[PDB]
Amino acid sequence: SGFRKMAFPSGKVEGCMVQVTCGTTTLNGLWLDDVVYCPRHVICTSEDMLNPNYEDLLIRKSNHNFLVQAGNVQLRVIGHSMQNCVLKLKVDTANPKTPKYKFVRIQPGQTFSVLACYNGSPSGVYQCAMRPNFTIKGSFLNGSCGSVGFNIDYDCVSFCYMHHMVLPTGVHAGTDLEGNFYGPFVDRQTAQAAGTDTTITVNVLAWLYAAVINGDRWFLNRFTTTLNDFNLVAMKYNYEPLTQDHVDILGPLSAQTGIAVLDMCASLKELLQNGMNGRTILGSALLEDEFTPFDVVRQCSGV
Amino acid sequence: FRKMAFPSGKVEGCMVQVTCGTTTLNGLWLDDVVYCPRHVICTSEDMLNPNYEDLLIRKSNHNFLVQAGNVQLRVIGHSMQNCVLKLKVDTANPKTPKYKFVRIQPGQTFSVLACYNGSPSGVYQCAMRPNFTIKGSFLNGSCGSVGFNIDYDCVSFCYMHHMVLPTGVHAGTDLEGNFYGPFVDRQTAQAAGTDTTITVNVLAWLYAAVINGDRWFLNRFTTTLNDFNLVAMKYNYEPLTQDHVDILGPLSAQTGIAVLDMCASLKELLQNGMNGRTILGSALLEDEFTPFDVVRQCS
Ligand SMILES: *[C@@](O)(CO)[C@H](C[C@@H]1CCNC1=O)NC(=O)[C@H](CC(C)C)NC(=O)c1cc2c(OC)cccc2[nH]1
Ligand SMILES: *[C@@](O)(CO)[C@H](C[C@@H]1CCNC1=O)NC(=O)[C@H](CC(C)C)NC(=O)c1cc2c(OC)cccc2[nH]1
């Protein structure tokens, strides 16, 4: 019963957050085994960040230039390398609370939990989606760099995001844990625009099914649509196309509710053309697109 | 603005499962006591119309299975406190945080750590409604999940889950076992009173809008607290208390907008509507962010 934007429990990640400081620059790092991972622009001064030659700036640093604090303990750095936009500090102590983990690069439209941290201290946890334009609508303040995004399956933490940048529009950009940005962004102190921000259609459909499972059907209709005719209307409204894989992925929700996927497409088509007429769905006045089909299935299966 | 939960790790380290017969739910292990909903002692048929004092008389310490994961914690004492059971166990939890038990007011927010079989599953922010329900997300097996706030290093537990209502909202107790609202722990359909909008939180939201430069709704008027409360009630808004006025103090100081001037602005929004305008990008006035949440997300 109910449907809420839900994050994974954050404790396995909290036990890995540390504080990294180089010069007057401080941000968060992720301590796994005997390595601390953090945004490489920590090595930068304020003047460097405008056009940093990172390889040039890094070679001029020594292991002792990096102060890593874990709680009240300082960890001694005994090596350091760079992998794209991520710095890897070898420390002489393995983190005893390292969980089972993997690094993965998430696909646009997928969700993950963010543990927002400041000065190496966890501050809040929330769910995000990787948008089609590879930005995320995060909540991050000064000092949040190095905060990470993750999913958990059984006991294994899959890290997928590390935070680097806020755009002029107030959305956020970052990298995977191999240091590659999501999107066309660069770790330099410049104002950057993203590509056009399309709506994650398969997710909107999942959330409509969640609304039905929770007792709201006001937006359904007796009509159907073909997949192509739906996509024509969806693209007109800057929605992503729905693929046959999306249709299949929605199967379990369609089975649970008895609403054919293309019948829900016809409902969404009507909502796009007519608007919501001051009504709300699951408490929202907008069509929500940051819950995946699996997000809905795991909260609403059996209800 | 977004709902943000507290990091959940300090609470995760306290979740256990408690079973009596085939009835299983979650409990909270702090020091050498495990707290859980007292209906764990019920068979399914017992929960239709339970006499808990009589049911408990028939239970002894050795009838309670407490597990941290798969590891059993031997129960060495038990007692009932309102609608919660307290099981003394022979092991003090080494992960016990600094904590307190608090009873919150409508409008206050908290994080819920939803758990199943003693295993944390998800975390999300909830607000206590004026009708003493929360809009949670809870499946079978979720009872005994807790809600909490974290202040510095101290976990303040405020909620333990017991009930879903026919409308699909949730009800529960504080950690002394006293329900929020008129609800009882019985297998029966129970109705919550009509709900109202949480005025103090809408005001916090309007302050948040002003902080971010969105201030078209500020008007030239003020009001008294009494006159405002009487108007607000005709729009299904809660009356403000003195505590509400006080907790708006910091946002009022930050923006320079007196609390009663902002109340007069809200009154105009209620009486005249939004005129197809938005506030913080929304035609809806948000009532699930407290003044603390607004400060916590702006700094
Ligand atoms: C990190 O904490 C820095 O360590 C920080 C996080 C942002 C602070 C405010 N909210 C955030 O998410 N990131 C930055 O400060 C980055 C630093 C880069 C990677 C060197 N820069 C930006 O976020 C950035 C710079 C500019 C800009 O310039 C000029 C103009 C407009 C936006 C903008 N963002
Ligand atoms: C706990 O897991 C029980 O241990 C369970 C939580 C609900 C299950 C599905 N989602 C939940 O939030 N709580 C219950 O099952 C309670 C048990 C009481 C305390 C003895 N029962 C209800 O919440 C319940 C019973 C009825 C009902 O009956 C008749 C009719 C309508 C609603 C309703 N809710």
Residue numbers in the entry:
A (entry chain A): 1 to 303
B (entry chain B): 3 to 301
Reproduce, without paraphrasing, sentences from the article in which this PDB structure was first reported.
The SARS-CoV-2 main protease (Mpro) is essential for viral replication and is a primary target for COVID-19 antivirals. Direct-acting antivirals such as nirmatrelvir, the active component of Paxlovid, target the Mpro active site to block viral polyprotein cleavage and thus replication. Residue 166 of Mpro, although highly evolutionarily conserved in coronaviruses, is proposed to be one of the critical sites for drug resistance in SARS-CoV-2 Mpro, with E166 variants showing the largest decreases in potency against nirmatrelvir.
In inhibition assays with nirmatrelvir, the E166A variant of SARS-CoV-2 Mpro resulted in moderate resistance, with about 30-fold potency loss relative to WT. The E166A variant maintained 15% of WT catalytic efficiency, while the E166V variant had only 6%. However, in each of the inhibitor-bound Glu166 variant structures presented here, all three of these hydrogen bond interactions that define the S1 pocket are absent. Both E166A and E166V variant structures demonstrate this alternative N-terminus conformation. Our structures of E166A, E166V, and E166V/L50F Mpro variants demonstrate two N-terminus hydrogen bonds absent in the WT complex: between Ser1:OG hydrogen and Phe140:O and between Ser1:OG hydrogen and the nitrogen atom of the γ-lactam ring.
